[PDB]
């Protein structure tokens, strides 16, 4: 995976309510929702109000998917813009479903890098188009 903060110019040119906020996010390449591509599934959401925690697992269609970091970012942002700020969101690749799952995991969990990414104008609109 490349740096979460950077976008390739080519792309540019309870538990059930969480699923409802994320299931219709459009993929950033194909013309389908992440639900339609089985990338988000209700059963991969783990929500613990008892601790202000939301953990989401997402499965890239191919284990070498170049878009994994972007898909995770768009899930993050959708939830960043819909949940009370008391919630700590964790978005992770489903275990064993991506060659570089740990590296993609680490970037999405770095709140600084995620913040820098959203100040990349091109990246931010790709994301906005996906989560609308």
């Amino acid at each position: 995976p490349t740096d979460i903060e950077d976008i390739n110019p080519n792309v540019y040119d309870d538990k059930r309510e969480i699923f409802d906020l994320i299931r219709n996010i459009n993929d950033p390449e194909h013309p389908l929702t992440l639900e339609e591509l089985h990338v988000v599934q209700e059963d991969l959401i783990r929500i613990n109000d008892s601790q202000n925690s939301v953990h989401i697992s997402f499965t890239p269609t191919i284990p070498h998917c170049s878009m994994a970091t972007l898909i995770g970012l768009s899930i993050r942002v959708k939830l960043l813009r819909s949940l009370p700020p008391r919630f700590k969101v964790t978005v992770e690749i489903t275990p064993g479903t991506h060659a570089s799952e740990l590296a993609v995991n680490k970037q999405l969990a770095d709140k600084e890098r995620v913040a820098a990414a959203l100040e990349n104008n091109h990246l931010a609109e790709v994301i906005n188009q996906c989560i609308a």
Partner: protein, 334 residues
């Protein structure tokens, strides 16, 4: 232990990433998401914003540090520049910009004398500038030994030794070599299992404390050639060994650590919204020290605590800032 809130301030819009004390202890600066720098003077028992430095950066301002003489303020920004603010005429203006990084600038730090300034970036590099002139900086080293995003640089309190912390999980140490005065990396400190967010030296630079995404803080000790503790000292380089790993005191990433040079107290800022204070026990083994938590504040902020810093003059006064849009000034008493 006593961790007592004195002040809750807020002037920025959005999250606040850094707070930094002026060396005279009576003024501090804060920076954040809103691309301004606020300078806060105290009069009476009231902290208020006396100047606002806008339009110096096009993106988030990540870190600011005053120069040791108090006349310069450096700000590091996601826009890939470092601004140097000086009161030339003047009120505070931006008299120099240090560019050269390809990516976000994460950290800035001054040497003890003020003659050297260091920055690091998401472009994996660490830069060292020489200060000579009123508002003119020439580059002296571009150091590339890190393999990922570098989060923080800090200088030795006394000597011209520089420390950097990385997303690549390591910490590096730099000095000049005698013949070819080139800057070279002289140590790599490895124990952490994830992103090192924070580093800070103890009073005399013989120890370093780090904090990490891996939820630990770690005490590193410098061992020197004539070593009494039986530590191998190859090529007579000081070697840094991890002599303590404070585990299980932090439920999320620890984003900053500050080591009070007046009292030796250590302060941490955590993604679980808490501020913790640690002290070395009275019967501490020097080669396996025990640091214990003497007071905590698990509800310090309503969101991630991003920075802490001990007042360099008022012993026990601590400043913090948070994603929650506030700055808090505490007083610690044991």
């Amino acid at each position: 232990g006593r961790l007592i809130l004195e002040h809750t301030l807020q002037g920025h819009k959005g999250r606040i990433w850094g707070v930094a004390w002026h060396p005279k202890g009576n003024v501090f600066a804060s920076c954040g998401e809103d691309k301004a720098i606020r300078i806060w003077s105290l009069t009476g028992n009231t902290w208020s914003t006396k100047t606002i430095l806008s339009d110096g950066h096009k993106r988030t301002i990540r870190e600011i540090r005053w120069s040791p003489c108090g006349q310069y303020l450096a700000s590091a920004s996601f826009d890939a520049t470092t601004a140097i603010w000086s009161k030339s005429s003047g009120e505070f203006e931006c008299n120099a910009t240090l560019e050269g990084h390809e990516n976000e600038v994460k950290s800035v730090s001054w040497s003890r004398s003020g003659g050297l300034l260091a920055t690091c970036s998401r472009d994996k590099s660490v830069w060292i500038w020489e200060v000579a002139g009123d508002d003119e900086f020439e580059c002296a080293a571009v150091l590339n030994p890190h393999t990922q995003d570098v989060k923080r640089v800090v200088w030795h309190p006394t000597k011209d030794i520089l420390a950097s912390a990385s997303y690549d999980n390591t910490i590096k140490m730099f000095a000049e070599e005698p013949i070819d005065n080139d800057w070279d990396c002289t140590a790599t400190l490895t124990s952490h299992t994830s992103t090192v967010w924070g580093i800070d030296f103890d009073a005399d630079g013989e120890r370093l404390v780090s904090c990490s995404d891996d939820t630990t803080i770690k005490i590193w000790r410098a061992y020197h050639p004539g070593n009494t503790a039986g530590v191998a000292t190859p090529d007579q380089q000081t070697v840094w060994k991890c002599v303590c790993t404070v585990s299980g005191q932090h439920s999320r990433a620890i984003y900053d650590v500050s080591w009070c040079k007046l009292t030796g107290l250590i302060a941490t800022a955590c993604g679980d919204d808490g501020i913790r204070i640690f002290k070395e026990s009275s019967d501490s083994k020097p080669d396996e020290p025990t640091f214990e938590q003497i007071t905590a504040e698990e509800g310090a902020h309503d969101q991630d605590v991003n920075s802490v810093q001990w007042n360099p003059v008022v012993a026990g006064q601590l400043i913090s800032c948070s994603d929650d849009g506030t700055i808090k000034i505490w007083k610690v008493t044991e």
